[PDB]
């Protein structure tokens, strides 16, 4: 049925219908536009009127302008023909390679899997990143979250995970670029064409890109996260295949909600957010999961406003995650990359019954020596090193070497470090931190552990620093 626009304030657009009033979540097509402009019905205001939010810019809209109702939510392309192609929030190509050649579409809104559909498998997924594998390792078919403030290595980490895990992977993948940099979309797109992960000619492409970047208005960023996971939902259930679902950045879903919340006529919650933060996050995050019918290994980048992890957005996200990698500006400031907080990142699989006791006992030994050192730092900055016991300044020297051996030069980060990329196997990680704990390298100097792959490179680098 046909309706008419009655108000336009930023991304929020009100539409009035004489006869057939469209329900919530339905996509409305705006007429008289050169490009396609979708408005999703968010609320019903009353008096035969509905409040909507725009998937593209609202500039040019006039009051009394006609709006048709699709009779369905935003339906997008799903299937193996999406692979190799770049989609946007409403399911159009933004790669300039003709239409998405498929005759089957899925609505971006859908109920999350029931409790009976849940799985309980949780075998380790070895990244090749020392700090992650040692202290808070990820699980196959499990939810992974990369926390961090502005400019501490969330993207550099998630790209390295794509480099290490996604290339050596039989099943398909989906990178949902939600509300971040169009430059980084270009970087990724052409880097995957180089490596043959996307192929422009044949149908052997593993990754299906979906992008709604910070150049777009809030309606795009508020829904492009859903668009991306609806592609992954097809590859989970209908195919029956291991899907990798990378998201960068899933804060932007919640942020985009906060931008329009005022104009939807809502009282603000704490720290300026919408009241519907956790429930809106819940119906989205519960869909991003592994079920009986298929396994999804979901890596999600999570922005942390003002470096405050207590902020409502990242605070709510923690509970949705099986493993968490929390980044710190304090650690990145010292050159320690990847700047993971070893006394804050955690995982469900960190158990002696899952990863073995030899792994577990070393991971807690590293956390203890670092945690004991963290308390000392502030005391021995004033009162001096010479007041410490010989047992203490042993644990201080070992801690500082352990901090440096948690650092690692990534291949994707070669342009920043100036060191060659290194992948450390789980066996050599555990042995490396075992030996440093026992005191087998107390004779060796401090800086030899900084920015090297395995423990062997520290011994070689230590001899190089002699002259």
């Amino acid at each position: 049925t046909t309706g008419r626009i009655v108000a336009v304030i930023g991304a929020v657009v009100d539409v009035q219908f004489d006869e057939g009033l469209p329900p919530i979540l339905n996509a409305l097509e705006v007429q008289g536009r050169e490009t396609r402009l979708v408005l999703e019905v968010a609320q019903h205001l009353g008096e035969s009127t509905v409040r909507t939010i725009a998937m593209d810019g609202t500039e040019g809209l006039v009051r009394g302008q006609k709006v048709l109702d699709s009779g369905a939510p935003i339906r997008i392309p799903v299937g193996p023909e999406t692979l190799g192609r770049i989609m946007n929030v409403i399911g159009e190509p933004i790669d300039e390679r003709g239409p998405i050649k498929t005759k089957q579409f899925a609505a971006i809104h859908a109920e999350a899997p029931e409790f009976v559909e849940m799985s309980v498998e949780q075998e380790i997924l070895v990244t090749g990143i020392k700090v992650v594998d040692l202290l808070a390792p990820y699980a196959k078919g499990g939810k992974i979250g990369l926390f961090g403030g502005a400019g501490v290595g969330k993207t550099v980490l998630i790209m390295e995970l794509i480099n290490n895990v996604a290339k050596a992977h039989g099943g398909y993948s989906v990178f949902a670029g939600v509300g971040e940099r169009t430059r980084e979309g270009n970087d990724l797109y052409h880097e995957m064409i180089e490596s043959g992960v996307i192929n422009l000619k044949d149908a052997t492409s593993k990754v299906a890109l979906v992008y709604g970047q910070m150049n777009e208005p809030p309606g795009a960023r508020a829904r492009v996260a859903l668009t991306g996971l609806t592609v992954a939902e097809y590859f989970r259930d209908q195919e029956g295949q291991d899907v990798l679902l990378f998201i960068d950045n899933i804060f932007r879903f919640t942020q985009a909600g906060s931008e329009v919340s005022a104009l939807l006529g809502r009282i603000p919650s704490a720290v300026g957010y919408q009241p519907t933060l956790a429930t809106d996050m819940g119906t989205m995050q519960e869909r991003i999961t592994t079920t009986k019918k298929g396994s999804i290994t979901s890596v999600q980048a999570i922005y942390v406003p003002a470096d405050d992890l207590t902020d409502p957005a990242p605070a709510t996200t923690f509970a949705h995650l099986d493993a968490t990698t929390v980044l710190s500006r304090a650690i990145a400031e010292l050159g320690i990359y990847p700047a993971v907080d070893p006394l804050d990142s955690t995982s469900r699989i960190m158990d002696p019954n899952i990863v073995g006791s030899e792994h577990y006992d070393v991971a807690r030994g590293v956390q203890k020596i670092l945690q004991d050192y963290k308390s000392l730092q502030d005391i021995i900055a004033i009162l001096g090193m010479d007041e410490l016991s010989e047992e203490d300044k042993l644990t201080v020297s070992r801690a500082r070497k352990i901090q440096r051996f948690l650092s690692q030069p990534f291949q994707v980060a070669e342009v920043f470090t100036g060191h060659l990329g290194k992948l450390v196997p789980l066996k050599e990680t555990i042995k490396g931190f075992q030996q440093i704990l026992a005191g087998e390298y107390d004779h060796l100097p401090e800086q030899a552990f900084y920015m090297v792959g395995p423990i062997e490179e520290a011994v070689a680098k230590a001899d190089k620093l002699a002259e």
Partner: protein, 53 residues
């Protein structure tokens, strides 16, 4: 030397105890003023957004 040393340390560490004691008082009050400010300022934001619809 050592009879002077232990006297000189006992004196200096008595002053270091008193100085740290007064710094706890200063910092504890700064902590509370900031605590109350954050609760107040956050509450003004909520009231400002609520009485504007």
């Amino acid at each position: 030397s050592t009879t002077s040393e232990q006297s000189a340390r006992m004196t200096a560490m008595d002053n270091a105890s008193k100085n740290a004691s007064e710094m706890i008082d200063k910092l504890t009050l700064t902590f509370n003023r900031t605590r109350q400010a954050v609760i107040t300022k956050e509450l003004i934001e909520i009231i400002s957004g609520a009485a504007a619809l």
